[PDB]
């Protein structure tokens, strides 16, 4: 039994270092919401150091509608662009994340979680695609022949249906213990209380912190963390 | 005996359309000093509907100098993203052509001219290199078994040595025999009044303008326009 621990990088923030130290996967962004050109070649060259699995992070560039054509488009740039940074060391590009809004409105949006499935697999087919567990990207991505990993969060609260529920309450280290059930088991405890499936083959770590040391007590609790390898 | 003609396109400015339709080679901006990735989606369908070869259009993002490394770095992040781009639509990116600054600039820095090659090469062994005739950049591109082609211009004076003279006077259609002279026997009379030799294998022709007119009345005076195919 294995689990992938991925994190976000490319942003300039946080300990990008220690952080690629105890993670399989890194999600690194380029050059939208955060990041630039150097920025993605110095976060390849210490993912390879570490051997971590390189992946990007696109962005987009009051839910006003950015049709799917402009989000395919604008997600082939951001992911060519590190691709092509990351082939140029000898690298290899091997999932794409969406990050913040765009994965957010993707969960949920199948038009566009069908854009940027599209634009992933016209980059490259054998890019692994993640995704929100239990979300229109994941059923997006199968839609398309391409590999899908489903992601999930030691943090965040879940209902009875498997999603998270909306942040604050909807307008503690029991978060390893959660995850580990959810690794495990797959399966969930809602805040209804009621037992919730999941597919949990990645989790998501914040090294925005000291928030380093949840992450290092995760996999102290953890069995054999690796990357997507499907 | 063939002639190659390019037009830099996806700014937005000029017209494009017309402009695909006389030229043999298009530099497409790649979203830093211009355009953006739905702009280079819509120049790369064009130019395939045209028949014309796709190309890129890097540049920058006080003559402060730019580590060459950075350079390298945001010209592989650009070209890139259009290679990535143009074969999502089944097209091949054919060329480079740095933009502006960075092209006048390399034009005379050997090293920047070396950075600029060495992103071409690691994007792809198969580009060709396009630069000033004469100048460091072209040094660069055969310096590293790059196919790389001259390019001249219509409108501007010559030097004894092959190269411009600064703009203005260095602090007509003319231009259709002087184009005419460069392509047919490789040589330009220069403005001291001694002819110089030049390569000139391609010719940039100005859309910013009704200066299409030139451009047409160029076509007319010409012998076969053609995409370098080295």
């Given amino acids: 039994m294995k689990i992938d621990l991925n994190?976000?990088?490319?942003?300039?923030?946080?300990?990008?270092?220690?952080?690629?130290?105890?993670?399989s996967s890194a999600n690194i962004a380029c050059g939208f919401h955060a990041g630039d050109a150097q920025i993605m070649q110095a976060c390849v060259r210490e993912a390879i150091k570490?051997?971590?699995?390189?992946?990007?992070?696109?962005?987009?560039?009051?839910?006003?509608?950015?049709?799917?054509?402009?989000?395919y488009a604008q997600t082939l740039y951001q992911i060519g662009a590190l691709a092509t940074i990351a082939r140029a060391q000898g690298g290899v590009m091997r999932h794409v994340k969406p990050h913040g809004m765009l994965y957010n409105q993707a969960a949920?949006?199948?038009?566009?979680?069908?854009?940027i499935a599209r634009a992933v697999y016209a980059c490259d087919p054998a890019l692994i695609l993640?995704?929100?567990?239990?979300?229109?990207?994941?059923?997006?991505?199968?839609?398309?022949?391409?590999?899908?990993?489903?992601?999930?969060?030691?943090?965040?609260?879940?209902?009875?249906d498997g999603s998270l529920?909306?942040?604050?309450?909807?307008?503690?280290?029991?978060?390893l213990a959660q995850t580990?059930?959810?690794?495990?088991?797959?399966?969930?405890?809602?805040?209804?209380?009621?037992?919730?499936?999941?597919?949990?083959?990645?989790?998501?770590?914040?090294?925005?912190?000291?928030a380093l040391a949840f992450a290092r007590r995760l996999r102290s609790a953890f069995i054999v963390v690796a990357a997507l390898e499907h």
């Fill in 7 to 23: 994190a976000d990088l490319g942003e300039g923030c946080a300990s990008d270092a220690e952080l690629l130290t105890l993670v």
């Fill in 50 to 71: 570490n051997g971590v699995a390189i992946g990007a992070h696109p962005s987009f560039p009051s839910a006003m509608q950015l049709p799917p054509e402009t989000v």
């Fill in 130 to 160: 993640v995704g929100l567990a239990g979300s229109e990207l994941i059923r997006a991505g199968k839609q398309y022949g391409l590999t899908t990993r489903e992601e999930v969060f030691a943090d965040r609260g879940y209902q009875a």
């Fill in 165 to 175: 529920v909306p942040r604050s309450q909807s307008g503690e280290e029991q978060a």
């Fill in 180 to 210: 580990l059930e959810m690794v495990q088991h797959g399966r969930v405890k809602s805040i209804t209380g009621e037992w919730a499936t999941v597919a949990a083959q990645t989790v998501c770590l914040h090294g925005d912190g000291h």
């Fill in 108 to 115: 949920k949006e199948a038009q566009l979680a069908d854009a």
